[PDB]
Amino acid sequence: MISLADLQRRIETGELSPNAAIAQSHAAIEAREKEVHAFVRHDKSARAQASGPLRGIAVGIKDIIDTANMPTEMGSEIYRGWQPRSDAPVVMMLKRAGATIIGKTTTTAFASRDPTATLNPHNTGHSPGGSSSGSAAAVGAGMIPLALGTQTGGSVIRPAAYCGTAAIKPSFRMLPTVGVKCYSWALDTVGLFGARAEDLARGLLAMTGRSEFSGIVPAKAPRIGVVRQEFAGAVEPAAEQGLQAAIKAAERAGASVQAIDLPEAVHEAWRIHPIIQDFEAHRALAWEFSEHHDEIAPMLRASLDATVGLTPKEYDEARRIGRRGRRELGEVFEGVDVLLTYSAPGTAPAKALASTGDPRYNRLWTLMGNPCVNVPVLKVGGLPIGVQVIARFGNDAHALATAWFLEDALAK
Amino acid sequence: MISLADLQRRIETGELSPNAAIAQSHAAIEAREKEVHAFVRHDKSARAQASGPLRGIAVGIKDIIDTANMPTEMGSEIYRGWQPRSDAPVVMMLKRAGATIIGKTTTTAFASRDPTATLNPHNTGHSPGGSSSGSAAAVGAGMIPLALGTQTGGSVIRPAAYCGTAAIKPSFRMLPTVGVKCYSWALDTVGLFGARAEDLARGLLAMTGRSEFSGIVPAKAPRIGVVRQEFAGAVEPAAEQGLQAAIKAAERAGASVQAIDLPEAVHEAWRIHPIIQDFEAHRALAWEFSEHHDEIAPMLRASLDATVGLTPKEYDEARRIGRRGRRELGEVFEGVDVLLTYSAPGTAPAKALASTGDPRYNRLWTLMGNPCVNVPVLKVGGLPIGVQVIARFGNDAHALATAWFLEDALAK
């Protein structure tokens, strides 16, 4: 994989030129696209910008995020050829920083469960996860140093884990969702994919200009709280192996680790996530559901059809339950700096299963809003397994700091 | 003005056909549009639907809200001829209920300060207010029974007051802002314009399907708390005259009225509203500011140029102040059912002043999130003056109930 931070340093010290860096991504993409299929469209004419911390940095954009110079097809035929008038605010944050929008990465139809043609870089016979399939695969394939995606359930953390890349789902609403195809406004959150935690930090620094993302360094002797989200059902062996490896490395590295059970209120929040997501989806995708019902991908159309009956009453109750969950989750962070848990059920499912994986270990955190970071741990049968580092709401900088510490710890 | 609730009843009993109702609206728009200029686009072919609670109900849509069959130009040359692919969720809520989207109403460029060509129905020499100019003017001129607008500062309540129409800015996020041109995601709120409070209730009921809007009836002897928002300075004579008239009518109607002071925390919330609005504006309008700077309307362009320096730091601090205000405000709604204040600085400004009016008496409430309702009280020099009814967050129904009460009390 390509490191954003590495590219920056080399460009800053005249070692590498912005153009060369971009040309390299162009090459990397063409070298493996026929095998990975991570891009809906590759803008081969894309050139590096003159200035900015992100000059020479090629970025892939999930195809539900608006771009003015390239179509935004939402992974659906309904939007074939669709061309937004303006660039989404998040795309502009990148451009203003000197980044190069190299292309649009594949997304499941409307960011749902319907598989794309994209394949896992580690094993062509496996899924790269979803819904941010192309962003994760492209970064995992070493095509680009950065990519944007989104998470409502777990479309940032899950595919990152599956493809073995670093990634972060910042605190809810930190990054604007304007110009981002909505599924559930109460959940939709923009995320970033990169090689390591440090790359994510530099990416967020350039995008937001927030000092907290500047000068970040690996955390020392972090206080980790391990949660296995039992309420989410049984996990696959490979996932537990990864978690245990992480815990062990962390301990050897000097961290303090303790197992803790989440409050019953938090469990409840996890349970009603589907209610909030599905109710709002009917509102957010009202036009598509009413005017182009039969054109909606199979799986998405099935979930919508099965949820037309959700009532405003139960919806409101679900949100109330979510709030309680957030309130009680905060107390948990009085003893620990971050929470460590699974990033996915296990290794990436085989493409033959026609599944982008289950977000049951991700969804709770999207609703809580806390910043989440994926840390690649190991590989089983050649397929990546990662862990999820979660910090207090708004403490994105610390989450990255701890993920960094964890990366170094695993490196022994 | 055309009453939505009135049409519903007559249509329901078979006294009025939906087709006739819609024909009525077209004729009404035709008779006053050439002088008011409230519509950016009037769809003369718009027909009535056969079923649903809003069948036969014509609705005007502010032109920052997406429509799939009509252009959405944001009141700016930058979006001349721009055609969204889909109808915004709020528009779909109306259509699914059987409503007829009769056209797009004028909006200031990107919902800011730059005046539109729309004129006040009560006096063409005055402003209809902004930024929801067309929606307020159209309803105020008796053209349509319902219209959608938006409020970030006071673009719902203020123009409603200026045009003498009933209107409501629902609780924050109760109505989706998807497909609604964003200015400030922390403030942007969809609102409705109608003849009377009852009309607003019926509209929300059909749109949301929430039982809280069903069976709404005038309130009895409500506990009103009068607040003059001193932090915003003194209002114009006409405005005070209207408030005094409202208080007197309410008292003689059996209501308990008492003057109340707003906690310092709330005052501060009002003060930092500009910080939040302007900071986000730069992110939300990044493409426009960076790629079409000189094409942006004069006033909005100047305010943007003057705020480029706002830091994320002062922004975060501003939000913290806002949250603090929200908590203490709730405490206020413990001894009183609703608050009563000004809807605007006074009568509608003369067009010559090139001003849509000062929203200093509206902005606080948009940030607090509380449901606000404008109640027409009287006229000065032929220009309408209204008052603003405010209830606790999520108590929209009660707000409407009390507003209805005030309407009846004013009629004596």
Side-chain angles (χ1 to χ4, degrees):
Chain A
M1 304 183 279
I2 307 173
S3 167
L4 187 169
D6 173 71
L7 295 173
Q8 285 194 310
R9 283 186 283 270
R10 292 198 289 158
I11 290 176
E12 188 73 299
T13 70
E15 278 182 48
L16 179 68
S17 78
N19 294 314
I22 294 301
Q24 277 167 37
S25 285
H26 280 306
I29 291 172
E30 290 300 296
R32 300 196 64 191
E33 258 304 275
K34 297 179 181 179
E35 163 196 358
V36 175
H37 311 106
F39 284 83
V40 174
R41 63 188 62 266
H42 175 193
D43 179 12
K44 292 250 55 178
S45 73
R47 299 179 109 298
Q49 291 199 67
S51 64
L54 293 186
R55 62 182 189 294
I57 305 301
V59 189
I61 305 294
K62 185 174 180 168
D63 212 26
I64 51 163
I65 299 174
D66 288 353
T67 50
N69 66 318
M70 289 177 255
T72 303
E73 311 184 305
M74 323 297 190
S76 168
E77 321 162 301
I78 298 177
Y79 289 77
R80 181 186 184 180
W82 177 241
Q83 182 53 254
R85 172 64 173 140
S86 62
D87 287 306
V90 287
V91 172
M92 287 303 300
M93 295 177 142
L94 293 167
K95 302 210 317 174
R96 287 184 168 188
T100 297
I101 305 307
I102 203 160
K104 311 305 290 294
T105 52
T106 68
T107 176
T108 53
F110 301 108
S112 191
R113 299 300 181 74
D114 294 277
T116 71
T118 310
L119 307 167
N120 194 308
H122 300 273
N123 194 314
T124 300
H126 289 257
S127 166
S131 63
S132 305
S133 305
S135 290
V139 171
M143 295 177 190
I144 50 182
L146 190 67
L148 293 191
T150 63
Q151 172 160 318
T152 306
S155 302
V156 166
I157 299 302
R158 185 167 87 269
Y162 281 176
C163 294
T165 82
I168 180 176
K169 181 205 70 60
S171 294
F172 186 55
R173 302 183 75 173
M174 193 184 87
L175 291 180
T177 53
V178 177
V180 183
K181 188 68 182 165
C182 180
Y183 194 104
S184 172
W185 57 88
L187 298 162
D188 294 349
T189 308
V190 181
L192 285 58
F193 299 80
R196 300 188 59 182
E198 162 174 41
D199 301 308
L200 304 176
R202 302 302 299 178
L204 286 175
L205 174 60
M207 288 181 75
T208 67
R210 310 177 84 79
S211 66
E212 46 272 64
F213 293 125
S214 183
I216 289 183
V217 75
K220 291 301 185 301
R223 296 173 179 172
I224 305 178
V226 183
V227 294
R228 293 183 163 75
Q229 311 184 63
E230 316 74 11
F231 48 77
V235 75
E236 287 165 37
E240 177 64 9
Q241 291 164 46
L243 182 58
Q244 279 183 47
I247 292 173
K248 183 183 179 301
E251 286 174 350
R252 316 297 179 180
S256 62
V257 189
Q258 59 176 297
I260 50 187
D261 295 300
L262 296 173
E264 173 56 29
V266 175
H267 299 196
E268 268 297 80
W270 174 88
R271 180 180 72 71
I272 55 72
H273 168 285
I275 300 304
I276 296 178
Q277 174 172 45
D278 298 336
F279 181 82
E280 297 189 345
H282 269 291
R283 271 70 265 175
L285 299 172
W287 179 81
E288 290 89 341
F289 189 78
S290 296
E291 313 293 3
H292 302 275
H293 187 270
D294 292 3
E295 288 168 79
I296 298 175
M299 298 186 193
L300 170 50
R301 194 176 67 251
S303 66
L304 287 171
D305 285 349
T307 57
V308 299
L310 290 177
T311 68
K313 179 175 175 296
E314 64 188 307
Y315 165 64
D316 292 319
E317 183 59 63
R319 294 187 300 162
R320 264 192 287 285
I321 293 174
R323 276 182 289 173
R324 293 186 184 63
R326 298 193 191 76
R327 171 159 49 269
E328 287 184 48
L329 174 63
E331 308 181 6
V332 177
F333 286 97
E334 304 190 315
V336 298
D337 303 314
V338 308
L339 301 178
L340 187 65
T341 189
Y342 314 108
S343 291
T347 51
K351 286 292 295 195
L353 294 180
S355 174
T356 60
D358 189 343
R360 61 184 194 263
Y361 299 105
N362 305 294
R363 82 193 211 194
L364 167 65
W365 317 107
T366 313
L367 177 60
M368 296 293 93
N370 302 61
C372 299
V373 180
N374 177 255
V375 174
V377 173
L378 53 76
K379 302 168 74 169
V380 184
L383 281 294
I385 291 290
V387 291
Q388 197 181 347
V389 174
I390 309 165
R392 190 190 294 278
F393 182 84
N395 284 186
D396 304 57
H398 190 196
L400 293 168
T402 304
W404 196 335
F405 153 80
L406 215 183
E407 302 184 321
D408 297 332
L410 290 163
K412 295 302 80 183
Chain B
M1 304 186 288
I2 302 172
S3 166
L4 163 39
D6 176 60
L7 299 181
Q8 270 196 319
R9 279 185 281 279
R10 291 200 291 148
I11 289 175
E12 180 67 1
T13 66
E15 163 179 347
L16 181 67
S17 78
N19 286 328
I22 294 304
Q24 239 82 146
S25 298
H26 288 301
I29 297 175
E30 225 58 287
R32 313 272 283 85
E33 179 56 4
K34 288 178 182 176
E35 51 172 347
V36 178
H37 314 126
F39 283 86
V40 175
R41 302 183 181 301
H42 171 197
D43 177 29
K44 284 179 175 59
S45 73
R47 305 183 90 288
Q49 297 197 66
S51 58
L54 297 180
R55 62 181 184 292
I57 305 302
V59 187
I61 306 296
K62 184 173 178 179
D63 213 31
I64 49 167
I65 306 173
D66 293 341
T67 47
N69 67 320
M70 295 179 268
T72 307
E73 309 177 303
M74 323 299 177
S76 173
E77 319 160 301
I78 299 175
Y79 287 79
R80 182 72 172 62
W82 173 244
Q83 180 56 257
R85 173 61 171 144
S86 61
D87 284 311
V90 287
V91 171
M92 288 301 306
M93 294 178 168
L94 290 169
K95 304 205 309 178
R96 286 181 165 189
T100 294
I101 305 302
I102 204 163
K104 310 306 294 297
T105 55
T106 67
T107 175
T108 56
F110 305 102
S112 194
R113 299 307 181 179
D114 296 281
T116 68
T118 303
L119 302 178
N120 195 304
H122 303 277
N123 192 312
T124 58
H126 290 257
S127 167
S131 56
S132 306
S133 307
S135 292
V139 172
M143 292 182 212
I144 56 182
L146 183 70
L148 293 191
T150 62
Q151 180 166 304
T152 300
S155 301
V156 170
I157 299 296
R158 188 168 83 267
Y162 287 174
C163 297
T165 90
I168 181 176
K169 168 216 145 302
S171 293
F172 187 59
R173 286 183 289 185
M174 203 193 95
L175 295 178
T177 51
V178 174
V180 183
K181 188 56 171 165
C182 181
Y183 188 107
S184 171
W185 60 85
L187 298 164
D188 296 0
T189 309
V190 175
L192 285 62
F193 298 80
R196 302 192 56 188
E198 169 183 39
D199 301 307
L200 300 175
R202 282 281 130 181
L204 287 174
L205 173 59
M207 288 179 75
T208 67
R210 313 183 72 184
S211 59
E212 53 198 285
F213 296 111
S214 185
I216 283 183
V217 161
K220 308 301 179 181
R223 296 184 175 65
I224 299 168
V226 178
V227 298
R228 289 194 169 68
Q229 308 184 69
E230 300 74 11
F231 44 86
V235 84
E236 279 154 43
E240 175 62 24
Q241 289 160 49
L243 180 56
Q244 275 175 45
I247 291 177
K248 185 181 180 300
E251 287 183 351
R252 195 163 67 177
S256 64
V257 190
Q258 64 172 298
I260 296 181
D261 284 302
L262 292 175
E264 178 55 56
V266 176
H267 293 202
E268 284 298 78
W270 174 87
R271 181 175 67 70
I272 53 74
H273 174 285
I275 301 295
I276 298 176
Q277 179 189 71
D278 300 337
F279 184 80
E280 309 194 329
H282 275 287
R283 316 315 144 207
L285 296 176
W287 179 77
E288 290 88 352
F289 192 75
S290 295
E291 312 285 12
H292 305 281
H293 178 282
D294 297 329
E295 286 165 270
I296 299 178
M299 290 184 218
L300 171 58
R301 192 196 308 145
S303 62
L304 284 175
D305 288 345
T307 56
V308 178
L310 289 175
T311 72
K313 181 175 179 175
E314 56 186 305
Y315 168 62
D316 290 337
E317 184 54 51
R319 290 190 296 158
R320 189 184 313 170
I321 295 172
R323 280 186 281 287
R324 199 141 57 198
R326 288 171 183 165
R327 275 197 300 291
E328 288 183 51
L329 173 58
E331 296 171 57
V332 180
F333 288 99
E334 298 188 308
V336 174
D337 303 311
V338 298
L339 304 182
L340 182 61
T341 190
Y342 311 103
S343 285
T347 61
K351 290 292 296 193
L353 297 176
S355 174
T356 57
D358 190 348
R360 61 177 191 273
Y361 299 103
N362 308 296
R363 80 189 204 199
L364 171 66
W365 314 112
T366 309
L367 176 57
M368 295 298 99
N370 301 63
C372 305
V373 182
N374 178 74
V375 180
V377 182
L378 64 303
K379 298 159 63 182
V380 181
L383 286 302
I385 284 292
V387 290
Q388 180 174 23
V389 178
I390 310 171
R392 334 168 319 83
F393 184 80
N395 240 54
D396 304 56
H398 179 53
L400 292 169
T402 303
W404 193 339
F405 158 79
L406 217 192
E407 302 182 327
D408 293 331
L410 286 171
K412 302 305 175 182

